[PDB]
Design a protein around this ligand. Sequence first.
Ligand SMILES: CC(C)=CCN1Cc2c(Cl)ccc3[nH]c(=S)n(c23)C[C@@H]1C
Lengths: 427, 558
Amino acid sequence: PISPIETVPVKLKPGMDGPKVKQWPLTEEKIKALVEICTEMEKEGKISKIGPENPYNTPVFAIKKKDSTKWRKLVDFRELNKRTQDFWEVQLGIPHPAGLKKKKSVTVLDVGDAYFSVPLDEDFRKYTAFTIPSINNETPGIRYQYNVLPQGWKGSPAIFQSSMTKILEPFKKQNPDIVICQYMDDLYVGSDLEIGQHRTKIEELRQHLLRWGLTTPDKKHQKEPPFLWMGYELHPDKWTVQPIVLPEKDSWTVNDIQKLVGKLNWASQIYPGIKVRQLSKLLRGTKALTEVIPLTEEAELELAENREILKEPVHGVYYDPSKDLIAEIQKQGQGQWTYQIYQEPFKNLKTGKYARMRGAHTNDVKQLTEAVQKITTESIVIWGKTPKFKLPIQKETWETWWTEYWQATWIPEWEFVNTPPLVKLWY
Amino acid sequence: PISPIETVPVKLKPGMDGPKVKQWPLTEEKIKALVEICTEMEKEGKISKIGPENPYNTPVFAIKKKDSTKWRKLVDFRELNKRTQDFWEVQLGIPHPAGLKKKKSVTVLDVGDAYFSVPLDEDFRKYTAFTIPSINNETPGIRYQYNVLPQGWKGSPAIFQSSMTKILEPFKKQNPDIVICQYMDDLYVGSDLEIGQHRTKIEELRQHLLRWGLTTPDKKHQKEPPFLWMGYELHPDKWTVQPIVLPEKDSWTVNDIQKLVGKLNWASQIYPGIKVRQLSKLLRGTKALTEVIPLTEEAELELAENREILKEPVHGVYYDPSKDLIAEIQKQGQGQWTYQIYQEPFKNLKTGKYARMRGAHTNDVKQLTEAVQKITTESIVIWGKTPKFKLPIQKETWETWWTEYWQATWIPEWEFVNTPPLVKLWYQLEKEPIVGAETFYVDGAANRETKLGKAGYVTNKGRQKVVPLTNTTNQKTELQAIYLALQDSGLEVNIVTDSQYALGIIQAQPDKSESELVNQIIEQLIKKEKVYLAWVPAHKGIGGNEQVDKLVSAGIRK
Ligand SMILES: CC(C)=CCN1Cc2c(Cl)ccc3[nH]c(=S)n(c23)C[C@@H]1C
């Protein structure tokens, strides 16, 4: 109420204009939530209703956070951030600590309810323009503004850095190796601490936090046992590109050697050292597919050689902080999925597989959506950033469902491949 | 009068300045009019005569346009409008009638000259300044400025909407059960109240607004039961678009076809069935619109076929949220599919269709699914629900379909129903190399320059064949090549190609296409029992290729 703070005088990146995004239609069930949510915020003045002197707008979505609990508002801040936060990340540049990925276990804590205090420069809220939809465009839509610091806005965490710093500093003074990292409103704190040490050491912070500024966290695990998430306690010291193994076909067949060769042929682009030629010779016939042709002593020397040429990766490791990282997904089998992030074609910094057998929930979309986010992390974890996702799904289909299973704060820029995978192998 | 409403402040675009647009002084004849018209307007308070401390000018036009018996005023500040900042988008979307709900009584009120009653921000006024010279020379250049939303001003609408949006508030608050919507300077008030009792509130409102200087000349709420909105024709229980004529003439030109097609798609919403594939496929020509389009027979068929439907007039129902929305589909023909959304048995709410998209060779099922989506999509935008789907297709089929595809999807709650066209897996490839089946190292090629090729192969059984080809691509030849493979092969077959292309194509398990070449291969695979196709690197030096490529010498050498 009547007691504020000052205002870091904010400004967009020179030359650009405020974002004017189009509000996607959402369900009634969603709208209703949003009517509720934002009205309380009108109540608590964090946000306010505006008029026509304002043309900007930024997307918003209703989301059931922390396991289908009552709804949560989510603004698709993608554009604004890109319109401010970029030259802005040249000033308030929130730092990225490498070694975290190296740590054994890292947890995430949403430190967003915080921002809801610090006011905003009266000449920038203008951009915080967001509209909530009137079903079937019957009403003119509810148009609010933001008065404090908006959770999705990248310019806000940056600002909040100040307090956050001290908020932690002491906790940091007692716990040094415990690296903590702030990305928007989520806290990633890493340690090589044993499960419970880490765990308790966690609530430790949670409490400390709460003490220092009603920076309240999410109570993920009571003294209760349930089939709930094993928390956002990742173990980044675990990451590999191993499974891209050559099939152990003791029963070598014309068909097989060919298949073999094929993978090896495109595989030549990811390991310019592999040569399949002498093997190509082993299938130079015009035989029956199902036929055994191991023979070529000179050839199996090739099988083995390259068979391990995999294990010894290439130069393809030069994280170019200028360039953007690209994520790419492969729907593998029932609940089998895969990806790879690279800035360059075969210069893929890391690849990995997602497994969660399509059964109890086989909604591709869900698993996809899941995956995405699960990838998103890694990326952040490591480079501290959101890749560009190449989604093997329909724009329109996805544009109608991620928001259902989507339980994350940020939203990465993505796109969809109507381009099937020759790349579809066991890898 | 006017409205004492809290005005809205407008700033001109950053770094910009008001129009210095003078006017070619119009005929001194219609000048007396401008003056006489503005004197009253000024006396109606709408204007404030000021000339000195204000450079900014705009041109004052005046003549008579439609059925009226008086001279009209016009002044477009297009220059100003541009210099003007941007507001909120008035109607980023039109409500779709099928989404509306049924009410006993409704009505529409022309909000008079809505904008005028509304007060221009006290400052922007200087900009809305204009000039009415007396004669050709004897003239003091009487300048005036608006105190209200000017006739042709960019914000005018946005503002006004906001204003009114507000003005109604208390009223609607107090009188909660009479939904309202405004359109242009028009008001649509409806409710489930007894004609007279409906009339009771109408006045209450009419009056309410009247307290705000908002002129509504409705006598006893004057409205035409048949509502002409965005083409739709509405009534408190049904909606439809009537004026829809599909012209018939001889010298069919392009513009007309397009118009036919627009006119056709429009009615589809309500009219269950309409087709447009050919008429459209036809329009495919480039830029020349004044030329005549040779509506071939296939076209005429769908046209008069459609015509038959159009002749007979159908109508649509409104929304009742106390029920399940239902989406039902059927394949009316090659490439074409249709849907209909209904609450209760045979009471049409909405129709329409999904036209097969880009990506020349596709699968019906995939397509069907691509279809369900559009449906899914609308229900959201309209009644924000997800219609339970009625799908003319087996679950085993469907299931196996998506369990196969590379891309991903989402099948809502849907039941299979028996009906005529049935989407199902016609052909279906193998997984492992068929044992015994004669292997076919199929190949083809073509010299793009020569525009000629050769299709052929060599079966494992020392068997060979070829066929020269005029007008063929390395691509066409490849398929062709497989097609032969298919013809000559038996029941079970192993086909081997060097085609990146055909490899994918066949694997796509598409169907119903425009490439005879493919259609055939399709029909053969259909005809078949067990095919195992496989793909290998054309020139990588596989001998299985080496020869099928070494036979290519019969055309030339390199
Ligand atoms: C499409 C427009 C301008 C609608 C306004 N409109 C009037 C109307 C009509 Cl004319 C028919 C069925 C209607 N169903 C509903 S709800 N309405 C409705 C209310 C709003 C008030």
